[PDB]
Amino acid sequence: HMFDVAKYLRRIGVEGTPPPTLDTLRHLHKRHLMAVPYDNSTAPDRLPASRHLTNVPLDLVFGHVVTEGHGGVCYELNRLFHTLLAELGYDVRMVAAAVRQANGTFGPEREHTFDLVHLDGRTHLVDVGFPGPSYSEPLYLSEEEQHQYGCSYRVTEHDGYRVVERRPKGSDWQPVYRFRPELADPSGWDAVRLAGTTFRSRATDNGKIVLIGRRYFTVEDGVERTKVLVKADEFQDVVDLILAGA
Ligand SMILES: Nc1cccc(O)c1
């Protein structure tokens, strides 16, 4: 009952109640990624003994992310964004994906939760809850190459999965994650079931900043730079920059 569109829109820097169009969807997606960081720092504290996502009141997540200004993880940020999009009139469908790992394999099949929107006869991928380098504006569900902020994307088909692939400047195509599109479900959120490595990131105007442990990544107009952070003060400055939003 505490979910509130206007409060959410203010939190992400969006004016008014913009119309249910593709241009609005693109703006909402980018603004959300710029304003609401991915952060798994306190994710365990919000988990339910039940292991069923429905036993995590949406108002709890809303209060943490929107009211209090914090970040969250894929089943928090995309769960909230699905609700926002539905209340703004979009036909939103929840989907889950398996994430490409560093070793080239894909992880558990439904680890990463995100959404699709079907609008005006076309389907778009929507994901404001992914820690690593990925798309700041929605992708079309198509193998046709798409270009945004200096990077290229495509959504290919392999062995019954659609695979999101990304290519920054100067590098090869690499998969991001894979999913079965036919399992999309308007009601799919209802069915979801030393400190650990911390993942924190947010979009910028022309790219993304990502901190995985000490591994700091930036992409700016498609040009990537990375650095393993040593100094505690520099590390804290990067954390602050990510969590402050934009
Ligand atoms: N939780 C999560 C979701 C997607 C990718 C990833 O590295 C972690």
UniProtKB/TrEMBL annotation:
It comes from the Bacteria. The modification Cysteine sulfenic acid (-SOH) is found at C74, C151. Coiled coil: none annotated. It holds the Pfam family Acetyltransf_2. One of its GO terms (molecular function) is arylamine N-acetyltransferase activity. Belongs to the arylamine N-acetyltransferase family. PANTHER family: ARYLAMINE N-ACETYLTRANSFERASE 4-RELATED (PTHR11786:SF0), N-HYDROXYARYLAMINE O-ACETYLTRANSFERASE (PTHR11786). This is GdmF. It comes from Streptomyces hygroscopicus.
